[PDB]
Copies of this chain bind each other. A is one copy, B any other.
Amino acid sequence: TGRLQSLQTYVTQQLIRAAEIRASANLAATKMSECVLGQSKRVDFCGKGY
């Protein structure tokens, strides 16, 4: 019972961390596709300034 509880705790924490890393990866993908492959008129996205 105790070791099981430890397992679900660890799995839950890993799931959450996977969620944050997925969000960060999506943000990075958008950064790559909007900065590198072009020029983004947005500010504070492709660096500071024009």
Write the residues of chain A forming the contact surface with B, with a CB cutoff of 8 angstroms: 8-9, 12, 15-16, 19-20, 22-23, 30, 33-34, 37-38, 40-45
Nearest-neighbor residue (CB-CB) of A9 within chain B: B8
Give the residues in chain B near A43, CB-CB below 8 Å. Answer: 33-34, 37-38
Give the residues in chain B near A44, CB-CB below 8 Å. Answer: 30, 33-34, 37
Known: A30-B45, A33-B45. 8 other contacts (CB 8 A): A12-B12, A15-B16, A16-B19, A19-B19, A19-B20, A33-B44, A34-B43, A34-B44
Which of A8, A12, A30, A45 neighbours the largest number of chain B CB atoms within 10 Å of its CB?
Answer: A12
Give the residues in chain B near A20, CB-CB below 8 Å. Answer: 19, 22
